[PDB]
Amino acid sequence: GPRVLVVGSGIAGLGAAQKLCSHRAAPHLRVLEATASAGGRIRSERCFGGVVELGAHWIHGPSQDNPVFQLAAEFGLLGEKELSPSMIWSSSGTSVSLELMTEMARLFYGLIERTREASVGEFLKKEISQQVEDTRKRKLAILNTFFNIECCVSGTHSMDLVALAPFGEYTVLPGLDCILAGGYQGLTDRILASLPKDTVAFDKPVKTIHWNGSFQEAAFPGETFPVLVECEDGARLPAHHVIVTVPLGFLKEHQDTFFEPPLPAKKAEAIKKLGFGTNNKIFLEFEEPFWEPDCQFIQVVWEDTSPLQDTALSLQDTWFKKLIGFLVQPSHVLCGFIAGLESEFMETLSDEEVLLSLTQVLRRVTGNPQLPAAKSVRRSQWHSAPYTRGSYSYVAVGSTGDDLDLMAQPLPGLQVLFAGEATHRTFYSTTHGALLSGWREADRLVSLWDSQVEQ
Ligand SMILES: Cc1cc2nc3c(=O)[nH]c(=O)nc-3n(C[C@H](O)[C@H](O)[C@H](O)COP(=O)(O)OP(=O)(O)OC[C@H]3O[C@@H](n4cnc5c(N)ncnc54)[C@H](O)[C@@H]3O)c2cc1C
Numbered sequence: 001g002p003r004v005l006v007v008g009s010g011i012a013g014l015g016a017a018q019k020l021c022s023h024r025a026a027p028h029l030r031v032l033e034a035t036a037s038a039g040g041r042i043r044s045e046r047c048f049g050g051v052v053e054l055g056a057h058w059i060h061g062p063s064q065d066n067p068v069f070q071l072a073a074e075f076g077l078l079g080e081k082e083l084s085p086s087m088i089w090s091s092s093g094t095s096v097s098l099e100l101m102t103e104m105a106r107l108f109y110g111l112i113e114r115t116r117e118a119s120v121g122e123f124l125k126k127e128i129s130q131q132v133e134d135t136r137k138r139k140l141a142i143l144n145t146f147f148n149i150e151c152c153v154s155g156t157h158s159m160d161l162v163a164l165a166p167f168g169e170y171t172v173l174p175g176l177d178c179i180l181a182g183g184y185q186g187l188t189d190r191i192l193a194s195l196p197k198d199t200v201a202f203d204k205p206v207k208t209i210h211w212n213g214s215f216q217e218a219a220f221p222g223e224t225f226p227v228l229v230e231c232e233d234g235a236r237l238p239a240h241h242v243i244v245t246v247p248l249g250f251l252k253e254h255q256d257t258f259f260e261p262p263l264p265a266k267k268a269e270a271i272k273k274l275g276f277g278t279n280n281k282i283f284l285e286f287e288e289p290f291w292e293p294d295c296q297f298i299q300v301v302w303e304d305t306s307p308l309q310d311t312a313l314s315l316q317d318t319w320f321k322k323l324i325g326f327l328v329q330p331s332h333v334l335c336g337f338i339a340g341l342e343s344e345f346m347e348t349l350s351d352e353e354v355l356l357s358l359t360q361v362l363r364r365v366t367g368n369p370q371l372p373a374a375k376s377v378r379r380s381q382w383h384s385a386p387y388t389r390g391s392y393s394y395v396a397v398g399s400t401g402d403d404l405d406l407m408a409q410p411l412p413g414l415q416v417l418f419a420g421e422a423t424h425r426t427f428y429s430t431t432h433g434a435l436l437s438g439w440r441e442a443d444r445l446v447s448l449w450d451s452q453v454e455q
Pocket of ligand 1: 007009032033034039042055056187205208246262279380382428
């Protein structure tokens with residue numbers, strides 16, 4: 001059969017491989033993965049006696065039309081409940097009014113809905129200013145955390161970097177978001193296991209994809225191929241088709257050396273224009289819980305902060321002021337979330353510094369200087385991960401939904417194909433977008449092979 005190489009073993013690459021290998025008449029296919037494991041941004045780790053998810057954690061919109069929900073159900077990865085609660089702490093050591101929280105959430109999320117109905121950030125700030133003394137500062141402080149939560153959601157440093165006009169293109173499927181009781185990496189491990197033996201090569205990063213050529217294979221019959229995949233280890237792999245599923249952050253940093261000749265101008269510009277920000281998780285293990293047992297999300301409100309003063313490239317007073325709060329993981333574990341440049345800075349700190357700094361933050365925020373220190377920390381480092389360089393894509397100011405279609409556009413003769421979350425116009429930044437993109441590329445190849453047969 002035709003020689004196919006898939007670059008990257010995340011859900012997009014695995015989905016593309018799954019669909020191509022399932023074909024009763026299958027191609028000769030290999031998946032080349034840079035790192036030691038499969039799953040990419042789906043990464044479940046044994047920690048604190050349980051499982052921590054360093055990447056994807058939720059199925060967004062777990063309903064019939066969500067292929068990730070469909071697969072998790074087929075694999076037995078969902079809990080019974082899935083198959084059918086916040087505490088607000090100020091940086092002053094006091095609780096925040098539930099009524100004021102509701103008022104600000106109604107103002108903020110009402111405006112988010114309106115943006116989906118220049119930048120998202122600028123629209124939100126202009127409207128909030130029109131809506132706008134200790135009650136005023138409190139209201140602006142609450143709003144500041146809501147902006148920081150939207151930064152985590154979009155995977156951006158600032159909502160001022162998020163394009164307004166394309167914002168509504170992102171599709172949210174019905175259903176309350178759920179986790180996988182069976183762990184998220186169980187999904188990618190199951191797909192990987194369905195592939196023929198030795199389909200995936202680990203610790204095998206690709207250096208350059210050479211295309212638009214006539215490359216002779218090493219052995220008889222010295223058959224010529226249009227593509228040659230050059231690995232970092234010197235491996236010289238001829239192919240008829242290469243499906244690239246590498247993250248947009250990797251493409252932004254290396255597209256100039258990763259493709260030979262360079263990509264067509266429109267695709268090279270799409271890579272540069274689209275957003276690719278950082279969102280990280282900080283898991284903190286505690287000997288005893290200090291929060292209410294019914295609590296699920298501890299939202300932190302930073303006193304005297306405001307989103308109206310902030311611009312696209314402004315930093316918070318300290319890196320930890322960008323942290324939104326903590327999700328209780330139901331050992332006693334909390335998961336803090338932090339996006340953007342402050343999150344990239346956190347990655348440069350040692351584990352000890354993060355643990356000590358967040359212990360001091362929690363002591364301040366709870367109004368308890370005796371609060372025991374976290375016993376252990378486990379944090380994601382997505383921006384410094386060399387084969388990812390960030391968390392997920394967004395349609396940045398200066399880019400549009402057409403740029404996500406340009407990411408998906410194949411190279412001549414389908415020599416090189418493109419899948420991955422940043423190739424999906426309406427489900428970018430999700431596991432289902434990434435999965436659907438892999439299936440899309442497999443389907444595109446099958447049509448070409450069916451057409452070669454017919455002629
Ligand atoms: C912190 C975080 C939280 C998230 N939360 C959610 C959530 O709750 N729900 C959700 O739906 N989505 C979420 N996402 C997004 C989701 O995880 C991704 O959109 C999706 O998993 C990406 O799949 P992919 O196949 O496109 O890319 P990846 O999973 O990143 O796979 C790409 C692969 O290519 C490999 N690679 C890179 N360069 C090379 C090279 N040169 N040679 C060979 N291989 C290479 C990488 O090592 C990697 O394995 C989150 C992501 C992060 C990081």
